[PDB]
Each structure stands twice: as structure tokens, then as C-alpha cells.
Design a protein around this nucleic acid. Structure first.
Length: 1215
RNA sequence: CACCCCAAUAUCGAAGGGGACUAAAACGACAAUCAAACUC
């Protein structure tokens, strides 16, 4: 359980009626110099006396609440059935059941039910008694355990009258099962039931009772009993506190508790302690590790421990069959006999700690087995043996590594304090948390700097023939343009004044951009700290060019009517109503907390289809052309409804936000800024390990917005009249070019006010302008997440900026591809573009590139071209008209977009052949055309209900009910349709077969693959950045204790460690810190090597160019050059080792990566917890990933095998 | 194979507990298996 958690165990009397006892969650809060205890409820935040509190905790922990509690909530005849009477007697057994006792229907005859009524009571009464006796047992044996609920369960199951109850239930079931429709209606009814307050737990056990299609096992009933028993907090564990003999030792006991539980923590211990004792042990340890004196120092003490008897000593109890805390005794007892005593011995403090470290480590292994034994008894862990959890050889290796971690953490903790400059006297928990927040932002920012350097490398390359090596623009100067520049870049680069006319490099780029970028890169890295600092470099004129650049990208609204208002010309009327909404640009600050429109989109989609009235969608065109216009309007309506300012005094209507704040808050108390507090509370929950915290809050906001859409904008989805077209195509064309009739309906399009206030906002916005939307997204949301966590408004501007640069990026991509192009006469367009070698026509064609178009045509042609006589209609109307062939090219946007993309040719392989095979039934079959319109959804609708019906039921139950549904066709028929299951299964694979092909032919796989490359490389990027940060901690820590000597700072060197590039004085030249003499560095490098960090070239980090893991990842060569030289797996291995200096990071890498694929494979998390190298051997290894399931059911996904293998290829491919 | 931390502690019913303070998770532009009795 928990104190200072969600369990409410602490008890405070209710204010309205003093007698009533109300239960509260209580917490620790730092008051300034010390922790204090506050109650932690929205209603109450009162301080708690430490002394009152500790006693209550101890009192709470031993209280025999349970018997009074079980009776207080329950009595026979209210325990389940609520079959009760007694003529004014509240609870009793056996007596006094009052036995044999808008439309009203009374009928004759149903004699039998009276027979079953009694059956109810024989049921409920037996149950109450069964429990009472067990609670009545004694100690109890049952509730004195840590896994008490399970013991209760085994006792409940075993050798009890419960089995008769199953028989009674079955008997009740049998009469209902066949004989009377009424019997079922009634049999269910005598359950409370529906109204007051009831526990989902009960409803499901009812739902199993009222169902004869599913079997009922005695297990289902027992499980209900404990769950009901917990549900009402009747059942708790009885744990006796340490025994004490008089008040003076009781006083001492309660004081160390208050220390252990309320008073101290990592920081608090550090502050009080302890005349320099800790530093000495760590100093003691570092030397011993360097010496190699250590292993035998541990290896000997381990034997003092005498493990083998302990393994024997432990084994004996486990067979005793409790599977509990008694294990710690056998351990506690064993230590007492083998070890002192007190006489042995007066020993060095450093020596003593190895005993504590060893002791408490092995006490951690005693938890390993105990956790396992519970984890083997239920389902499968499974069946691991002590024998090789204690493994004196394995233990020796593990124990050593825990000693280096201890020694390491302390060094780093001091360094972290040092490098930041937090005062060692006031360190507290509150400061450390807000330091985490930025530390997280800092890792992201640096990675951001490192992608923009990757982008800059492509645009810019060294003048000399000699070096093809990376250019570190920041932290660095006679650059010359790269040979392979996109020419998309020059326009941005030219605009920025980075490039002089003729493409020669600008003066400004050297001071304005590079100088600022580096100083800014170093404020992040060096915890600077200061004025920031440029009085300084950068000016509004310099800045204004940036603002003007952002403004230029946006297409005007008038242009962005290629979503055909033909659609809306019905129906003109809603559009004026929306523009007519008045909003204020204040930004409110509520808006930040609401979901992205991307979240709400699907429901908006969902409703329009869900709405009954709308007609079937013709081909498509139309649906693509109807939804898209609708989505964009909804996207801009989502925003206007949020920014709407308060309505004028005579409107009945509620502004959307006001309805939302009213829904989330209780009635009559609607005076609050509750939106923010829900997000902030939901963000904290997520922090403490509730991953649904933020989705659950989101979907509320959505539900409420979807409501608001239905109530005020119903017509926008109400489309009684529509046509499949061409008539629409005609409509757009007939409409198009009636230039004299220029005017088209348009959405408001807002207005733009970009402003820059610092040099920092301007390097970032520039950087934003330089790399992909996927990347700017990651650091945007990190700007967001920090601002909320720290409750600052520093970053709000750059967010708005970064938002704008993005909405402009993805709208420009709306206009140009569909409208400016595609020309559709590609050989012609290439000569139309080559002739070319705000506005939409028109110039945005800059993005259009001749080489790319040629490539696009060529790759499509490869797909189209027939081999031999064998030719094809297939791919018709997908890539070509219709008619025919080369005359026109269809715009498969997914293919056209990107093709950046050094990767693309490499990435495309393993898609490219597979594209050719797929038949187009898209097209191809009326069945194929049919599958989309009626049926992709038909299944989704069917799976949905099944999921909803199922949820919260056990896997064991779901499994049979599911088998029963497969097995009995008549049972299956109700839900959903096309009974039986066999028929459904075939429609499922049918859609499963539509979606497989569809994904290849629009090349959805490029998107998935291109995403995998950036995420994986991005997290791996974070991680080298963490390592770099750590070295600063290691140096600072090593220095703060007097174990290393530094005479200087080489400011303007980012890195904390030096190269052997030298030749001499490299140590005081290479690194940010300055070392006194080789000895200093020679000692440093050695202490480091002790922890698994190899600082002597060439050691992974220092291999000359792109040979170090560091350089390969940090220069982003998994997105730009995949598969060259090294397997992605090879490299995932090689970082997972570079970080092996700190157990904290164990399988940090592996986990990090495979969650990039969580969505499209079925990760075995158990097997991701074990040790492994993917890269070497371990062919068997994935394994790590299993094919995806859904329908729960667990039906194989439309692309389960293909995607999972696609990934496998991706990682391993090494050519 | 998570990791760190909490005593009078080498060891003492810590057989307890803390952890935005630490990784992982989460978040992420465009984009899915998980009081009682009376009132209904």
C-alpha cells in the first residue's frame, strides 16, 4: 500500500457531523528547511503533527478493523442477493428472512419462482457465513500476510460450502436457463442492482450469472468476494509493529520512524550527515576500484555471508507453502547466527559500508524470489529457482557493479550540485524536481542543435577537397557550399542572408548565426548562468528578416479554397456564421491545455459517418473531396470556438469554454479556472505512473466539445443532398476560371503577429525553419511540457512561433501538390519546371523540383511496366488514367512528399518490389469497392461492441465466452451480425486483405519507415547527450572531492573530456575543464575506466570519424545514411554498452527503441527485461517482438507479419 | 537483470516506506483487446 499516495488510510473526522469518520490521503511537503506533513485533499490541506501521525500509522497498521467492518457493510441477506425482510429487523441469520413474501403487471401463475427465492437465500446466507467463519479464524492466519488477498482466496476456494453454492446458482440457472423467460428476468432482479451505488465488480458477476451461454466456475465467485471485500475497504493487512517494552523505548521507536518516513530523504540525509563520513568511503572506493583491490574484498565478505546454508535455509520454508515475508526472517535469522553479535568487530567505516551494501543488496534478492513466488503461483512467471538467484559467482559480479554505482552516484550528486551551483547547505527536493524539468528540456534542445547541424551539413560543406567530415557549426571558418544542395535550401538560405549573391557565403552567417548559436549551445551545456549575454549580438533588423520569412510562407485564404466551396455552396450560410464568430487573440491560456485538433478530428469524422442521414460516398474523389473540406473547416472551427470571447448580454447560449468548465466541475460551483488544474493534475498523475492520465482527461474535453458541436453546429454534418459526381468535378471546373466571378467563400484565416524578443527565440525560430516538421514537433511539445510543469511563461512565444512555422509548413503542402500541381503530364511538367529553372501557382513550385519529378515518374514507370507478354490493367486508376498510361500521372502524395531524402532509395527497398504484386480491388471488385463503403467499419463497429462488452473481465473468462461465441452459432447471432462467427471471420480477413494491399500502393510504408528512422535516431541522440552531461558530473564530482585537480576553464569548449589529438597540452586544450598535469588526466581516465568509460583513443567514442558511436548517432546518420557500414542493431548495441557504466540505464536503449514499434508489433515486455545483445548471434532474439493482435479475439492484424518483418529487415540490414 | 534513497544499523518486524528529484513510461504536426434499514 502507500502513505503519501492514492490509498486513503489516514482518518480525519467529518466537519458536518463529527461522529462520521471520513478518510483522507496525506502527504509530505517541504516547508523550507524541513519536511512537514500536510493532509492532501482538495478540501483539506491542514498540517499534521508528526507525533499524532506516526502513531496513527502504527495504529492503522495493526488494527483489526476487518470483523467489525465486514459485518458493518454486510449482513446475511444483504451480502449479495439483497433478499431481505425480517419485519423491522435490520440484519440477521438465519432469521428473520421475511420468507414467502408506468405499468404494473401481475400474473398467475409462477409458483416456481417462490422456490427459487428460497434458493437465493440459501445462496446468500451460505456465503455470508463462509466469510464470517474465515474472518473468524483467529490471528488471523490470512490477513497477516503481505499478499493477504491471495491467501484469503485460496482459503475461500478450498474445501468449502461454496461448491454447493455453485450448485445452487446452477440450479437457479437451469430453471432460468430454459423454462421461464420470466425466471431470468426475476433471477437477475433480486440483485441490488441498479440505482444507488454499486461496484462494477458486482455487475460482472451478475452478468456471468444471468448468462448460461457461459459456464460459471467456483473461481469466478471467490474472485468476486475478495474484490467486493477490497472494493469497500473492509479487508486490510494486519501487521504488528516492532515490540517495545516501556514508554521510553516506545518513544525512541516512534522517533526513528518519523525520521525514516517523514523527515529525511536523499537530500536531507546529505545535509545533516555526517562530519565528512561519506566522502571518505567514496574516496576509499574509487581507489580500490582502480587498484582492483576490491573484488576479493567483496568476494571474501560474501563468504562471511555463508550463502549455501542460506539457500538451504530458505528452501525449507518455501515448501512450508506460505510464499511470504517469513523469508526475510529466515534471512534475518541466518545473519544473526553467522555474523556478530557486536564484538566482531570494531572496523573501519569504509569497511562497514561494504557490509551494509552487501547486506541490503542480498535483502534485495530476498525480495526478488518473493516477488517471483507470487509471480509464479498466479499464471506463469514461472517456476524460477532460488539456486541461481544466489549464485555466489553471479552475486560477486552483481555486487561489484552495485558498489561502483554507489560510488558513482555520490560523485555525480556532488558534481550535479557543483556544475549547477546549487548550495550544498540548502539542497532540497523541491529544487531538484524543477531541475529535472529543464534537464529534460536541455537534452531535447541539444539534440535539436544536433539535427540542425545535420541539416546544415547537407547545405554546407568544407571548401577543401580533403575533408568530408562533419562541420560543427556551433561550438566551432571558410565554408563553401555543398555540392549536393537541394536548391529548396538556397531560397531559405539566401533569404536569411547566410548566402551572398552567386551563392558565396555571407558575412552575417559567421557572426550572427554561428556565434549566437554557439554561445546559446554553451549556456545550455555549461549551466550558464548569466546575463545572456550578448548585449548583444542580434538586432530587430536581423530578427525582422526572420519574421518576414515566416510571414511569407503562408498561402492566402483566398488561395486555400481548393477545398471546393462547391461542397459548401448549399450551405453557404454556415460559413458566414463561422467567420461571424468573434474571438480575441489574447490567447486566453485555456487553449494551451486542450487537445490538438488532431485528437479531436476522428470524432468529428466519426460523427458525420455515424450520423444516420448522410448518403453513401461515390468513388473518390468525392469522399476525399468532401471530408477534406469538412476537416479543415472543423479544424478552424475548433479554434474559433475556443477563442470566442464572451457573448453579448442577450444571448441564451453558452460559449464553449464555459460549458466545458461547467461540465468538469460540480454544479453551482462553476466559478473556477478548472481547465488548467485538470491538465496540471492529469500531468502529475502521468508522472507518478498513470499513462492513461492524459488520454482520460483528453477524451472528456473531446466528449464535451463533440456535444457542443452537435448542439450548435448540427447542419455542418447534415447533408440530405449530395451527388457522387462528376457533377461536382464539373462544378469545381465550371466554377473555376469564372475569373470575372472572382469571389469564393473563404474561412477567416486569422492574422499573423510573429515577434522575437531574445537571441534565444531567434536561433530557435531559425532552427525551426531549417528542419523537418517531425523534429520541430518534438521540441515544441517539450517547450510545452516544461512550461506547464515549472509554471512559467518564458517559452510561450517560441511555442506560438514553432506552432506557426508548422501550420504554415503543412498548409503550403496542401496548396502546392493538389493545386499548383500535379501537372499530370509529367514529361511535360519536367520541361515546365525546368523553364522555371503570397501565391499558390506561382512560386511555391520552388518545392517542385525537376530531378524529383523525373525520379517520381521513373519509379512509377517501374511499377507499371509489364514483364513479357504479361501485362496489367492492375494499377489502373491508382497510378494512371483511364486514360492512359503515361498521358497522365495520378498524384500519390505519399510517394511525392519527402523523397528528400538520401535515404529514400535505400529506404524504398523492401517496399519497392512488394508494391508490384498487389491486385487493385479498389477499384477491382464491386466487392472491393463494397468493402470500403459498408464494411471496413462494419467490423470496427463489431469489434468495438465486443471490446466494450468484454472489458474488465478476466482473461480466463474472456477466453471461454469467446469460445462459446465461436462454438454456438445461435449465441453468436445477436452480436454483431452475419452469424455465425465463421461468416464474420471471413469478412474480417476480407477487410484485412483490402488494407494489406492499400498500404503498399500509396506507400504508407515510407511514412512508417521514415518515422522509425527519426525517432530511433532521436532517442539514441538524447542518450549520447545524457552521456556528455554525465561527464561534466563526473569531472565536477571527482574534483569536488579532492581526487582530481583542475587549474582552469577553457570556456567555449562544449565537451568535458579531451582528445589525445594533442599533441601536448591537449588535456588543458581539448576540454572545457583544464587538467594540471598528465597525472590529473591520467588519473581521470583511469577512474573513468573503472566505471566502464573508456577515454583512451580509440575507444568507441574517439575512433577517428563516424567510427565512434558518439559521432555516428549525434550526427544523425540513421536518418541521412541508413544501412551504410553498420546495422542499426549493431549501433543500438554499441550505445547500450557505452551507457553500461551506470546500472540505472540498463536496457534503457533497447526499451527506448522497441517502443518506436509498440504500435505495430506485440512487444514481449518480459523478454525485454532480460539481458541480451541483438547484434551478435541472438538470431532468435526477436522474440523481442511478436505479431500484433486485435479483436480480443486477438485476430491477426491486416499487416502483422509484413510490418513485423519489415522492421526486422530494417534493424539488421547491413549492406 | 530496473536504478537511487530512507535507522539507533554491519545487524536489529524495514516483514515498512519515498522517488517529476532516475531511467523507462507519459506527453508529441499530418497522422485502436485490454454504513445500514427505507427510496429505484
Amino acid at each position: 500500500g502507500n502513505l503519501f499516495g492514492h490509498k486513503r488510510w489516514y482518518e480525519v473526522r467529518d466537519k458536518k457531523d463529527f461522529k462520521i469518520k471520513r478518510k483522507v490521503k496525506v502527504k509530505r511537503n517541504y516547508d523550507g528547511n524541513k519536511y512537514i506533513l500536510n493532509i492532501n485533499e482538495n478540501n483539506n490541506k491542514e498540517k499534521i503533527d508528526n507525533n499524532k501521525f506516526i502513531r496513527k500509522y502504527i495504529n492503522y497498521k495493526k488494527n483489526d478493523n476487518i470483523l467489525k467492518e465486514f459485518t458493518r457493510k454486510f449482513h446475511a441477506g444483504n451480502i449479495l442477493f439483497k433478499l431481505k425482510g425480517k419485519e423491522g429487523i435490520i440484519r440477521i441469520e438465519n432469521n428473520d428472512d421475511f420468507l414467502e413474501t408506468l405499468r404494473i403487471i401481475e400474473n398467475d401463475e409462477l409458483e416456481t419462482k417462490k422456490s427459487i427465492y428460497e434458493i437465493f437465500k440459501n445462496i446468500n446466507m451460505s456465503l455470508y457465513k463462509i466469510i464470517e467463519k474465515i474472518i473468524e479464524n483467529e490471528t488471523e492466519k490470512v490477513f497477516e500476510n503481505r499478499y493477504y488477498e491471495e491467501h484469503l482466496r485460496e482459503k475461500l476456494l478450498k474445501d468449502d460450502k461454496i461448491d454447493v453454492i455453485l450448485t445452487n446458482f446452477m440450479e437457479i440457472r437451469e430453471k432460468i436457463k430454459s423454462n421461464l423467460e420470466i425466471l431470468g428476468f426475476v433471477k437477475f432482479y433480486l440483485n441490488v442492482g441498479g440505482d444507488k451505488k454499486k461496484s462494477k465488480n458486482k455487475k460482472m458477476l451478475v452478468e456471468k450469472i444471468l448468462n448460461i451461454n457461459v459456464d460459471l466456475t467456483v473461481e469466478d465467485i471467490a474472485d468476486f468476494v475478495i474484490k467486493e471485500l477490497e472494493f469497500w475497504n473492509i479487508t486490510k493487512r494486519i501487521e504488528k509493529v516492532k515490540k517495545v517494552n516501556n514508554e521510553f523505548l516506545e518513544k525512541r521507536r516512534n522517533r526513528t520512524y518519523i525520521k525514516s518516513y517523514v523527515l529525511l530523504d536523499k537530500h536531507e540525509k546529505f545535509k545533516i550527515e555526517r562530519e565528512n563520513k561519506k566522502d571518505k568511503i567514496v574516496k576509499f572506493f574509487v581507489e580500490n576500484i582502480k587498484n582492483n583491490s576490491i573484488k576479493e574484498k567483496i568476494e571474501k565478505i560474501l563468504a562471511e555471508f555463508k550463502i549455501d546454508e542460506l539457500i538451504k535455509k530458505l528452501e525449507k520454508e518455501l515448501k512450508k507453502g506460505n510464499c511470504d515475508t517469513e523469508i526475510f526472517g529466515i534471512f534475518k535469522k541466518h545473519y544473526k547466527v553467522n555474523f556478530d553479535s557486536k564484538k566482531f568487530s570494531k572496523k573501519s567505516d569504509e569497511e562497514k559500508e561494504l557490509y551494509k551494501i552487501i547486506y541490503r543488496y542480498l535483502k534485495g534478492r530476498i525480495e526478488k524470489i518473493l516477488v517471483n513466488e507470487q509471480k509464479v503461483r498466479l499464471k506463469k512467471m514461472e517456476k524460477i529457482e532460488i539456486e541461481k538467484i544466489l549464485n555466489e559467482s553471479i552475486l560477486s559480479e552483481k555486487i561489484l557493479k552495485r558498489v561502483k554505482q554507489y560510488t558513482l552516484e555520490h560523485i555525480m550528486y556532488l558534481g550535479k550540485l557543483r556544475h549547477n551551483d546549487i548550495d550544498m547547505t540548502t539542497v532540497n527536493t523541491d529544487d531538484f524536481s524543477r531541475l529535472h524539468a529543464k534537464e529534460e528540456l536541455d537534452l531535447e534542445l541539444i539534440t535539436f542543435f544536433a539535427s540542425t547541424n545535420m541539416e546544415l551539413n547537407k547545405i554546407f560543406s568544407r571548401e577543401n577537397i580533403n575533408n568530408d567530415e562533419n562541420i560543427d557549426f556551433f561550438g566551432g571558418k571558410n565554408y563553401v557550399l555543398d555540392k549536393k544542395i537541394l536548391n529548396s535550401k538556397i531560397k531559405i538560405i539566401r533569404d536569411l542572408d547566410f548566402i551572398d549573391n552567386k551563392n558565396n557565403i555571407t558575412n552575417n552567417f559567421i557572426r550572427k548565426f554561428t556565434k549566437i548559436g554557439t554561445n546559446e549551445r554553451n549556456r545550455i551545456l555549461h549551466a550558464i548562468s548569466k546575463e545572456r549575454d550578448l548585449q548583444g549580438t542580434q538586432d530587430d533588423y536581423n530578427k525582422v528578416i526572420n519574421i518576414i520569412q515566416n510571414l511569407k510562407i503562408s498561402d492566402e485564404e483566398v488561395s486555400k479554397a481548393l477545398n471546393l466551396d462547391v461542397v459548401f455552396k448549399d450551405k453557404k450560410n454556415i460559413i458566414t456564421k463561422i467567420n461571424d464568430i468573434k474571438i480575441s487573440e489574447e490567447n486566453n491560456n485555456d487553449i494551451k491545455y486542450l487537445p490538438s485538433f488532431s485528437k479531436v478530428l476522428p470524432e468529428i469524422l466519426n460523427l458525420y459517418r455515424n450520423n444516420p442521414k448522410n448518403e453513401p460516398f461515390d468513388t473518390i474523389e468525392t469522399e476525399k473531396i468532401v471530408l477534406n473540406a469538412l476537416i479543415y473547416v472543423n479544424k478552424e472551427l475548433y479554434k474559433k470556438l475556443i477563442l470566442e470571447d464572451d457573448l453579448e448580454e442577450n444571448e441564451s447560449k453558452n460559449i464553449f469554454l464555459q460549458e466545458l468548465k461547467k461540465t468538469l466541475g460540480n454544479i453551482d460551483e462553476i466559478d473556477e479556472n478548472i481547465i488548467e488544474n485538470y491538465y496540471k493534475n492529469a500531468q502529475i498523475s502521468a508522472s507518478k505512473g498513470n499513462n492513461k492520465a492524459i488520454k482520460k482527461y483528453q477524451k472528456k474535453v473531446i466528449e464535451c466539445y463533440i456535444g457542443y458541436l452537435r448542439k450548435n453546429y448540427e447542419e455542418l454534418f447534415d447533408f440530405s443532398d449530395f451527388k457522387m459526381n462528376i457533377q461536382e468535378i464539373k462544378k469545381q471546373i465550371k466554377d473555376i476560371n469564372d475569373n470575372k466571378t472572382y469571389e469564393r467563400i473563404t474561412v477567416k484565416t486569422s492574422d499573423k503577429t510573429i515577434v522575437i524578443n531574445d537571441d534565444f527565440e531567434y536561433i530557435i525560430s531559425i532552427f525551426a525553419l531549417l528542419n523537418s516538421n517531425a523534429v520541430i514537433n518534438k521540441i515544441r511539445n517539450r517547450f510545452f511540457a516544461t512550461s506547464v510543469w515549472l509554471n512559467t511563461s518564458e517559452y510561450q512565444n517560441i511555442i506560438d512561433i514553432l506552432d506557426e512555422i508548422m501550420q504554415l509548413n503543412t498548409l503550403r503542402n496542401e496548396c502546392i501538390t493538389e493545386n499548383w500541381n500535379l501537372n499530370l503530364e509529367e514529361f511535360i511538367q519536367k520541361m515546365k519546371e525546368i523553364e522555371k529553372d503570397i501565391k499558390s501557382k506561382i512560386l511555391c513550385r520552388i518545392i517542385f523540383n525537376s530531378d524529383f519529378l523525373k525520379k517520381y515518374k521513373k519509379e512509377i514507370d517501374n511499377l507499371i511496366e509489364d514483364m513479357e507478354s504479361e501485362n496489367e490493367n492492375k494499377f489502373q486508376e491508382i497510378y494512371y488514367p483511364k486514360e492512359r498510361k503515361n498521358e497522365l500521372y495520378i498524384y500519390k502524395k505519399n510517394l511525392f512528399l519527402n523523397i528528400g531524402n538520401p535515404n529514400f532509395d535505400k529506404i524504398y527497398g523492401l517496399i519497392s518490389n512488394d508494391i508490384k504484386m498487389a491486385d487493385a480491388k479498389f477499384l477491382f471488385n464491386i466487392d472491393g469497392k463494397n468493402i470500403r463503403k459498408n464494411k471496413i467499419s462494419e467490423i470496427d463497429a463489431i469489434l468495438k461492441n465486443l471490446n466494450d462488452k468484454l472489458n474488465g473481465y478476466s482473461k480466463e473468462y474472456k477466453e471461454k465466452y469467446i469460445k462459446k461465441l465461436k462454438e454456438n452459432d445461435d449465441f453468436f447471432a445477436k452480436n454483431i451480425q452475419n452469424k455465425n462467427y465463421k461468416s464474420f471471420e471471413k469478412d474480417y480477413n476480407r477487410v484485412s486483405e483490402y488494407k494489406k494491399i492499400r498500404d503498399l500502393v500509396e506507400f504508407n510504408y515510407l511514412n512508417k519507415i521514415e518515422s522509425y528512422l527519426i525517432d530511433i535516431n532521436w532517442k539514441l541522440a538524447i542518450q549520447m547527450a545524457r552521456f556528455e552531461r554525465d561527464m561534466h558530473y563526473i569531472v565536477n564530482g571527482l574534483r569536488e572531492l579532492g581526487i582530481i585537480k583542475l587549474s582552469g576553464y577553457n570556456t567555449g569548449i562544449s565537451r568535458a573530456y579531451p582528445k589525445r589529438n594533442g599533441s601536448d597540452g591537449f588535456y588543458t586544450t581539448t576540454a572545457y575543464y583544464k587538467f594540471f598535469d598528465e597525472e590529473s588526466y591520467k588519473k581521470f581516465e583511469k577512474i573513468c575506466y573503472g566505471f566502464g568509460i573508456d577515454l583512451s583513443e580509440n575507444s568507441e567514442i574517439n575512433k577517428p570519424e563516424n567510427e565512434s558511436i558518439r559521432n555516428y548517432i549525434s550526427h544523425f546518420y540513421i536518418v541521412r545514411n541508413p544501412f551504410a557500414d553498420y546495422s542499426i542493431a549493431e549501433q543500438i548495441d554499441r550505445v547500450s554498452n557505452l551507457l553500461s557504466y551506470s546500472t540505472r540505464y540498463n536496457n534503457s536503449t533497447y526499451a527506448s527503441v522497441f517502443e518506436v514499434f509498440k504500435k505495430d508489433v506485440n512487444l514481449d515486455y518480459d523478454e525485454l527485461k532480460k539481458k541480451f545483445k541483438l547484434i551478435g548471434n541472438n538470431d532468435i532474439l526477436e522474440r523481442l517482438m511478436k505479431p500484433k493482435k486485435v479483436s480480443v479475439l486477438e485476430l491477426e492484424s491486416y499487416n502483422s507479419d509484413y510490418i513485423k518483418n519489415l522492421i526486422i529487415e530494417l534493424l539488421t540490414k547491413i549492406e
